[PDB]
C-alpha cells in the first residue's frame, strides 16, 4: 500500500511555506501518491538519490516534467540533453561539458571576479539595495549573457524565458497555462539568438557552434544546444545567489564566519544551494516494473523527486534546517546526481563563489529592511524582491 496525500506541491500556499509539507511527504512513507496530480512522489534523500542514479529504469526521455512525452505533445521541441537518455544523451552532454569545462572556467574567472567586486562596491554607494534586482539578477546578467556572446538587444527576455521553461515542467495549473499563453515573443528572441551569426566569437555560443566544424554535431543540433544554456543557465544562478544572500542576511553569525575566512565562499554558496534548492523538483518515468522504497511501481509511470526535500532530510543531514557554511555538502542533490548532473555547475559555483568572496571582503552586515516578496514558479524557488541594507566593512 502506498500512502495517499492531498498535498499540492505546485500550489501557492506550498511555495509560501513548503517545509511542513515536505516533512509530511518524507514521513508518510518512502513512496507517496499525490491525489492532486495522480502521480507517485519520493521526498527522502535515499530514494531521490537512488532514482537519479538509475537512468535506465528511471528515464528522462519521456520528459522530466509531469507531461509524459510518449503520450502528450511536448510544449516545444525537446532538449537534446535534459530530455534524452543514454546513449542519445551522451554526445550533446560531451559538447556542453567541454564548453563549460574547468579549463574554460580558468579563462573567464578573473573577469567574473572583477565584475563581482565592482558590483559590490557600487551597491555599497547606495547602501539600501534590492538583493534580487540589484545583485542576484544584476550580477549574473552582467557576466553570463556576455560569456555566451549574446548581443545587447532583447536580453530583457532571458529571465522570463527561463521562468517559462521552469513553469512548463509543472502540472497544468494557472502558472503553467499563463506562461505558455505568453511564450511567443520570448521564444522568438531565444530562437534568433541560438543562430551562429548572432553569437560573438570566443563565447559559449560560438564554442558550441564550432563543434559543427569537426562533425561532432550537426548545424541543426547546434542551435538546440545553445537553447539549453539559455534555458537553464541564468535563472538558476540568480536564484542560488539570491538564496546565498538571503541566508547570510538571516544567519548573521555565518556571515561573520565567512568574513573571518573568505576562502569559505565556495562552500557557503554550495550550502545555500542545498539549503534553498533553486530547482525544487524533477520527474522521471519508469521503463519497467520496479521496486522503489518497498513498493512495486509499474512500467511507464511518472515519479516526482523532491530535490529540496532530499536536501533537508534528517536521515542524511545533521540539523538540515540550519545554514552552516562549513557543512560537508558533498552529495546534496541541488544540482542533481549522476549522468544528468548539472553540466553548468562550474559556471554556477564560479559566479556564486566570486560574489560571496566579494561580499566576504567588502561587507560587514546585511540586514533585511522592507517587505520580502516571493516569486512563484512550478519548479524554481526564489524571491522576487529582498530589500537589504548593506553596511561597508
Query: Is residue 236 part of the contact set for ligand HEM (CB under 6 A)?
Result: yes
Per CB under 6 A, 62 contacts ligand HEM: no
Q: Does 343 bind ligand HEM (CB under 6 A)?
A: yes
Phi, psi of 238 (to 5 degrees): -55, -50
Residue selected from 21, 47, 85, 235 as contacting ligand 1F1 according to rule CB under 6 A:
235
Question: CB under 6 A: which stretch of 12-20, 178-186, 248-256, 277-285 binds ligand HEM?
Answer: 277-285
What span, in angstroms and rounded, lies between the C-alpha atoms of 7 and 34?
A: 7
**Cα separation of 366 and 392, whole Å?**
9
Q: Could you please report the per-residue DSSP string of 13-41?
A: HHHHS-HHHHHHHHHS-SSEEETTTTEEE
Minimum distance from CB of 164 to Cl ion (Å)? 8
Residue with cell 512525452: 69
Size of the site for ligand HEM (CB under 6 A): 27
> Is there binding between residue 159 and ligand 1F1 (CB under 6 A)?
yes
Q: Given the rule CB under 6 A, which of 33-41, 44-52, 73-81, 305-313 is the region that contacts ligand 1F1? A: 73-81
Q: Which residues bind Cl ion (CB under 5 A)?
A: 76, 187
* Residue 160 sits in the site that holds ligand 1F1 (CB under 6 A): yes
Nearest Cα to Cα of residue 375 among 99, 209, 208, 179: 179
Q: Is 194 annotated as a binding residue?
A: no
Residue 187 binding result from ligand 1F1, ligand HEM, Cl ion, none, given CB thresholds of 5 to 8 Å by partner type: Cl ion
Task: Give the nearer residue to ligand HEM in terms of CB position, either 327 or 340.
Answer: 340
Closer to ligand 1F1 by CB, 94 or 295: give it.
94
Binding ligand 1F1 (rule: CB under 6 A), the pick from 18, 163, 278, 308 is 163
Is 340 annotated to bind a ligand? Reply is: yes
How many Å apart are CA 93 and CA 79, to the nearest integer?
Answer: 11
Q: Does 71 bind ligand 1F1 (CB under 6 A)?
A: no
82 near ligand HEM, judged by CB under 6 A: yes
For the purposes of burial, counting CB atoms within 10 Å of the CB of 227, is it exposed (0-12), middle (13-18) or buried (19 or more)? buried
Query: Would you give the distance in Å from CA 378 to the centre of its chain?
Result: 12
**Backbone angle region of 4, left / alpha / beta, with phi > 0 → left and psi within -120 to 50 → alpha:** beta
Please indicate if the annotation marks 186 as binding a ligand. no
Q: Which of 310, 287, 282 is nearest to 297 (CA)?
A: 287
- Decide if residue 169 touches ligand HEM (CB under 6 A): no
Amino acid at each position: 500500500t502506498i500512502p495517499h496525500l492531498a498535498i499540492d506541491p505546485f500550489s501557492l500556499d506550498f511555495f509560501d511555506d513548503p517545509y511542513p509539507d515536505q516533512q509530511t511527504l518524507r514521513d508518510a512513507g518512502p513512496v507517496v501518491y499525490l491525489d492532486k496530480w495522480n502521480v507517485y512522489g519520493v521526498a527522502r534523500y535515499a530514494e531521490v538519490h537512488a532514482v537519479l542514479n538509475d537512468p535506465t529504469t528511471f528515464c528522462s526521455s519521456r520528459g522530466v516534467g509531469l507531461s509524459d512525452f510518449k503520450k502528450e505533445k511536448p510544449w516545444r521541441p525537446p532538449s537534446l540533453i535534459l530530455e534524452a537518455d543514454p546513449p542519445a544523451h551522451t554526445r550533446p552532454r560531451a559538447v556542453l561539458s567541454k564548453v563549460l569545462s574547468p579549463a574554460t572556467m580558468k579563462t573567464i574567472r578573473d573577469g567574473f571576479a572583477a565584475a563581482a567586486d565592482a558590483k559590490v562596491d557600487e551597491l555599497l554607494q547606495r547602501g539600501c539595495i534590492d538583493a534580487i534586482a540589484d545583485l542576484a539578477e544584476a550580477y549574473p546578467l552582467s557576466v553570463f549573457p556576455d560569456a555566451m556572446g549574446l548581443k545587447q538587444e532583447g536580453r530583457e527576455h532571458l529571465l522570463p524565458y527561463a521562468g517559462l521553461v521552469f513553469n512548463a515542467f509543472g502540472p497544468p495549473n494557472e502558472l503553467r497555462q499563463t506562461a505558455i499563453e505568453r511564450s511567443a515573443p520570448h521564444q522568438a528572441y531565444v530562437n534568433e539568438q541560438c543562430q551562429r551569426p548572432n553569437l560573438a566569437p570566443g563565447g559559449f555560443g560560438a564554442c558550441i557552434h564550432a563543434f559543427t566544424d569537426t562533425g561532432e554535431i550537426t548545424p541543426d543540433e547546434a542551435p538546440l544546444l545553445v537553447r539549453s544554456l539559455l534555458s537553464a543557465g541564468l535563472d538558476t544562478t540568480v536564484n542560488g545567489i539570491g538564496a546565498a544572500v538571503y541566508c547570510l542576511a538571516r544567519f548573521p553569525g555565518e556571515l561573520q564566519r565567512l568574513r573571518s575566512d573568505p576562502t569559505l565562499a565556495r562552500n557557503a554558496f554550495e550550502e545555500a544551494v542545498r539549503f534553498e534548492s533553486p530547482v525544487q523538483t524533477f520527474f522521471r518515468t519508469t521503463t519497467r516494473e520496479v521496486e522503489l522504497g518497498g513498493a512495486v511501481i509499474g512500467e511507464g509511470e511518472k515519479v516526482l523527486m523532491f530535490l529540496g526535500s532530499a536536501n533537508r532530510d534528517p536521515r542524511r543531514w545533521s540539523d538540515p534546517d540550519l545554514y552552516d557554511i562549513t557543512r560537508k555538502t558533498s552529495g546534496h542533490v541541488g544540482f542533481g546526481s549522476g549522468v544528468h548532473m548539472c553540466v553548468g555547475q562550474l559556471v554556477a559555483r564560479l559566479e556564486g563563489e566570486v560574489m560571496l568572496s566579494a561580499l566576504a571582503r567588502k561587507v560587514a552586515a546585511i540586514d533585511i529592511d522592507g517587505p520580502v516578496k516571493r516569486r512563484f514558479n512550478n519548479t524554481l524557488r526564489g524571491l522576487e524582491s529582498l530589500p537589504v541594507k548593506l553596511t561597508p566593512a
